[PDB]
Design a protein around this nucleic acid. Structure first.
Ligand SMILES: [Mg+2]
Ligand SMILES: [Mg+2]
Ligand SMILES: [Mg+2]
Ligand SMILES: [Mg+2]
Ligand SMILES: [Mg+2]
Ligand SMILES: [Mg+2]
Ligand SMILES: [Mg+2]
Ligand SMILES: [Mg+2]
Ligand SMILES: [Mg+2]
Ligand SMILES: [Mg+2]
Ligand SMILES: [Mg+2]
Ligand SMILES: [Mg+2]
Ligand SMILES: [Mg+2]
Ligand SMILES: [Mg+2]
Ligand SMILES: [Mg+2]
Ligand SMILES: [Mg+2]
Ligand SMILES: [Mg+2]
Ligand SMILES: [Mg+2]
Ligand SMILES: [Mg+2]
Ligand SMILES: [Mg+2]
Ligand SMILES: [Mg+2]
Ligand SMILES: [Mg+2]
Ligand SMILES: [Mg+2]
Ligand SMILES: [Mg+2]
Lengths: 93, 131, 87, 64
RNA sequence: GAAGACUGGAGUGCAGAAGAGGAGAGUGGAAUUCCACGUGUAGCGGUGAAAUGCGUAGAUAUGUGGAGGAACACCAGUGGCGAAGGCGACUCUCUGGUCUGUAACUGACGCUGAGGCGCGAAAGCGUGGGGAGCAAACAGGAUUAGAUACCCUGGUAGUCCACGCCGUAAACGAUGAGUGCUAAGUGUUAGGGGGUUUCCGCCCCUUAGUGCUGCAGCUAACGCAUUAAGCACUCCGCCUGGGGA
């Protein structure tokens, strides 16, 4: 069943470590039998409200076609525990 | 209907009279056709016709009214319901309205009116009162 | 619910002929599979009553079908009951 | 008045499209009543779902 | 009763649709309360009036930061879902029911159902947690001929969550379930078909819910009236003057 994950990376980050944290979660989804279809970044945007002391963020979108529903759970846990993502949302469609 | 189709036939006729309808159609059966034929031959309706279809068939009846209404048939009732069946001896066949009405009795030679069941001296299950 | 495929293998396995879908041998098998699937959900989710009612309704329907099959034709009933491991 | 998505055949109100949803929220972000927007109930439900889903991702303000 | 046959009741298959239906886990923003720190200073709060109360040990107000609990503005509508109780923030996992369309499949496989077994608002009980607001009991201030009350200032059990009991209500549509038949007019929810139009769109038909107004019919009257309290068949529960009770 297809999926869609959005997440916001903090603004104050440099391109190298930003790409590292972009690709770490792609790898973590691929650690399970979940095929990625997209990994494009949706770009810098200004938050309508300050979720943290922050005001801007890198919006990133990922498409998946998983079945076991464990890859999304592991992504949820290890993105909640990390401080390089401020907000994420998984959607089924 | 679910339980008793003869009562359904009688109540369809009664419901049609109350609003002065002209005809009515209903599902067909081997006993309903014969009841309709008795009603026609006795003089309580105008006509009966049979329309054919896939599963069981349909029967339509054309009702009868006087010159200015005055319902020819003014009352029906069922006597032997599925919850209690009543049988009448040859000397117990009821007389409806001093013979003004008729009673239908399913004897051993088909279904008969009240009058002709007293000619063969036979009896059986009474189905309905019509008057 | 059983995934459409999972239902279709059962249907194809218990067919009494090449095209049936509603014969009692098929309905009883599918209902048995469904209530077995609901058994462990009731076991682990012990406070879901609105699904327990559905389970009970399924059990009653399947029992009525079994009674009809037994009355109509005993040999089919005794073959199918051994196939499904009922009683 | 006439419905928007019904006229334009828009069968999906995605939550990634902020500019479209800007029309249906008032100056404070409160969802406009269906009487003023003029949309059908079936599409109003999808619209409200999308508005809340978009609000969750900081795309639209909760209170402006 | 037996031996066959049929598909209209019932169910399955195939294609679509809507929904605060239920259980578990995670997350969100407003708002009250409290705490810390700057500005400031003489009041704040409260009522028909006033007082109890809080404040120079510096509040109330105002700016920033932190802690915790409970409920989910606008959407929201005689709208939706569920057998009833009831269900309103968002996401994921596990799940039950319903409607429309097709005619592929089985061929009466159906209805009701005493005793039995399950669910059952709130208050209440047992063990272990939590406690921001609210508030039985309680204290003080008011009103009154009196005021174990209404009003004001506070305030514990509880309201919340885990497990197990309790089994009640104006648990109401004061209307048991199933089926069939009997004028019309107009809103709304979820679908299907057709005519027109370039599409939107306008009009008609139809299935399943939900409202209103009304003919026949019924009722003691009020009123009900295709969602009957009308005309009928099947099964169940209940009633036979009031008090004692
Ligand atoms: Mg059918
Ligand atoms: Mg739902
Ligand atoms: Mg739900
Ligand atoms: Mg806050
Ligand atoms: Mg302050
Ligand atoms: Mg219902
Ligand atoms: Mg055949
Ligand atoms: Mg029943
Ligand atoms: Mg009982
Ligand atoms: Mg309680
Ligand atoms: Mg307790
Ligand atoms: Mg006092
Ligand atoms: Mg208080
Ligand atoms: Mg009682
Ligand atoms: Mg009592
Ligand atoms: Mg109630
Ligand atoms: Mg009562
Ligand atoms: Mg009834
Ligand atoms: Mg159309
Ligand atoms: Mg209707
Ligand atoms: Mg009706
Ligand atoms: Mg009455
Ligand atoms: Mg007495
Ligand atoms: Mg007495």
């Amino acid at each position: 069943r297809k999926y869609e994950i959005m997440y916001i990376i903090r603004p104050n980050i440099e391109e190298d470590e930003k790409k590292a944290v972009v690709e770490r979660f792609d790898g973590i989804l691929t650690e399970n039998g979940a095929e990625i279809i997209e990994s494009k970044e949706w770009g810098k945007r200004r938050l309508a409200y300050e979720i943290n002391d922050y005001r801007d963020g890198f919006y990133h979108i990922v498409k998946l076609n998983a079945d076991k529903a464990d890859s999304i759970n592991e992504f949820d846990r290890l993105a909640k525990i990390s401080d390089d993502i401020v907000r994420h949302m998984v959607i089924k469609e | 209907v679910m339980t008793d189709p003869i009562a359904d036939f009688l109540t369809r006729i009664r419901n049609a009279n109350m609003v002065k309808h002209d005809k009515l159609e209903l599902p067909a059966s081997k006993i309903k056709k014969e009841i309709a034929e008795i009603l026609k031959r006795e003089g309580f309706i105008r006509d009966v016709e049979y329309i054919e279809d896939d599963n069981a068939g349909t029967i339509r009846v054309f009702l009868k009214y006087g010159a200015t209404g005055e319902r020819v048939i003014t009352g029906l009732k069922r006597i032997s319901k599925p919850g209690l069946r009543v049988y009448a001896k040859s000397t117990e066949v009821p007389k409806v309205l001093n013979g003004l009405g008729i009673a239908i009795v399913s004897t051993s030679q088909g279904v008969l009116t009240d009058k002709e069941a007293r000619a063969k001296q036979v009896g059986g299950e009474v189905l309905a009162y019509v008057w | 619910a059983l995934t459409q495929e999972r239902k279709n293998e059962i249907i194809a396995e218990y067919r009494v002929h090449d095209t049936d879908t509603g014969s009692p041998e098929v309905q009883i098998a599918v209902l048995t599979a469904e209530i077995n699937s609901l058994n462990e959900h009731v076991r682990v989710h012990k406070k879901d009553h609105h699904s327990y009612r559905g389970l009970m309704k399924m059990v009653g329907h399947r029992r009525n079908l079994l009674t009809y099959l037994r009355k109509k034709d005993v040999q089919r009933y005794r073959e199918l009951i051994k196939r499904l491991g009922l009683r | 008045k006439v419905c928007y998505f019904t006229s334009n055949g828009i069968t999906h109100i995605d939550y990634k499209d902020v500019e479209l949803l800007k029309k249906f929220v008032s100056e404070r972000g409160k969802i406009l009543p269906r009487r003023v927007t003029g949309t059908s109930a079936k599409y109003q439900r999808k619209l409200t779902v999308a508005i809340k889903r978009s609000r969750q991702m900081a795309l639209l303000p909760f209170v402006a």
